[PDB]
What we know:
Helix content of chain C: under 10%
Keywords: Cryo-EM Analysis, Spike Protein, monoclonal antibody, protein binding
Largest sheet of chain C: 6 strands, mixed
Oligomer: part of a larger assembly
Entry title: State - I: Spike 2-up RBD with THSC20.HVTR04 (Fab4)
PDB class: protein binding
Structural class of chain C: mainly beta
Chain A: THSC20.HVTR4 (Fab4) - Heavy Chain
Strand content of chain C: over 45%
Helix content of chain B: under 10%
Structural class of chain B: mainly beta
Organism of A: Homo sapiens
Number of helices of chain B: 1
Largest sheet of chain B: 3 strands, antiparallel
Amino acid sequence: QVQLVESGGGVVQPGRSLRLSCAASGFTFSNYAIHWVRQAPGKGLEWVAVVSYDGSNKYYAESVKGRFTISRDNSKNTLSLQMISLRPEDTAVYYCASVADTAMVPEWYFDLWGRGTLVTVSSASTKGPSVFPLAPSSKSTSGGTAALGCLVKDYFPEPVTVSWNSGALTSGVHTFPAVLQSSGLYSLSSVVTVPSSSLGTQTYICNVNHKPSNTKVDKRVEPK
Amino acid sequence: TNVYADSFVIRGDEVRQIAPGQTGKIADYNYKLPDDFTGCVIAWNSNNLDSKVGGNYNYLYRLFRKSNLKPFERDISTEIYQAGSTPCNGVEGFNCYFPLQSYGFQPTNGVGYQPYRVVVLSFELLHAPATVCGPKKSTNLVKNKCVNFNFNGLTGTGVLTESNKKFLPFQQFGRDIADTTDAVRDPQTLEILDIT
Amino acid sequence: QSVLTQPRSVSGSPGQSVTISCTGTSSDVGAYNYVSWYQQHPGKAPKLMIYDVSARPSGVPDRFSGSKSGNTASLTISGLQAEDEADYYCCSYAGSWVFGGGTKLTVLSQPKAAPSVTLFPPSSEELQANKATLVCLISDFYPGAVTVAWKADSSPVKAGVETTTPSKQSNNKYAASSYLSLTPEQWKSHRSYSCQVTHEGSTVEKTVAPT
């Protein structure tokens, strides 16, 4: 079995260093080039580097030069990727990318892929969320349907569970998956769809629970 | 006869030099063909797996030689070149010019520098015939009608029908008396026939 | 040049044919003949489908096909199956490997659903906290392709935009969300802010007011 197994991934801080690797099996690794192609979660593909068997010819990308260093060992059929001065835009799933033997495909194309490992360059810590009540607009178009919610913002890590009126409010509840902003934090949204004639009598409370940070904020959602 | 053929790879620019009475770089320093070199030459592409990682230096060629090659001469020789009057003792000085610089099979170039799956059919003649030849298409048979026939060396014309006469494991021929050929066991079904 | 131009999504009926462009430059596409096509399943690695635009590797079905003239490659997949529903990537190598923008093929298995957009202003308690987050919510849409366009009374705003890639909701449609982080001084300066979505060419616009 032609097989590539990445190693060296993890979660690091900005300003530090890391060294990745990839072991090869099933093919003569000394006769074909391996590459690093990175992919951020949910984003496109981005090549990083390449190393030659004599160790002389290496090509880097424009966001790669001066920081990342690839090397290989033809005897042990493994390699290394020495990486210094890490920035949070380098957070991507890293693939050691080579070619197998059976294909006519050369080494500059990409047939034989690895399973990948995750490298996270982030400085965010265990932060509790800030629950901000998304105030509805039932005061002008009453009689029909109003939308109200509360905004969950600036927490880390996953997950945060949101229930409505201690779980009694179930119809119309749709809690959304979160975003991942530049600071390394997360932010979700939960909005329940209510009849607009029930906001003057019924109080709507969202129950925001963040278990790794032990944060339970009960925030009321009142019209302006 | 003499179906000595070679299986190797050649760069795209030096392809035509495999020719009767041609010179160049391969035909000067690497592989010589004599005059009246008839037969066939065939090459085709071996592009995209003849590139090892950053420089295909598994594959060599002699870039320097003192004198002319003889034809059919294999230059497996660690005798490196000498340019000046000072002989090289292995240390690369100024006049060594190590002839076994290797193939530049790095196909980022155009079509002229590409590794090609080449063969060199070298055909000559010695005194023993009946060597490698061609499978001449092996047509059908017919019975009970007069017809021309050509067998494996012997031939004639007549009708082909069944027979009572028997053979052994060696016969390819049959005649009753005084070179009147009448009996062939066929070379495919191995079944005996008569020629009326 | 830096990123090869692709359509963000191509919707096609199953069994039909789609054509996905890979628009590059003369130093990227028209220089050599080395253009690839890469199918990447979500949660898995990519997979090669096309070399050298004309032909296919081993194991690749003949449904994958390419055409190139000038500086635009064109992957053509005839007879769309549900297993082709993934991300598509084109790459070229003249001196460097330049990938494409990304193309999500959506194999249509249910009729088209228009997105319901509900835009929320940031709360007064957030405005007292010297922050502002505009809340634009997308739900109940199929095929899974929306692009969020923020607007300040006539004008596109691209800075401070965080948008979720569409993920599955319960009834086989998708859900999404987009955030615009601003200052409270920019909130009370203009007149109205709008969140425009674009779903298979259809535009649904919602507008809130700082009043």
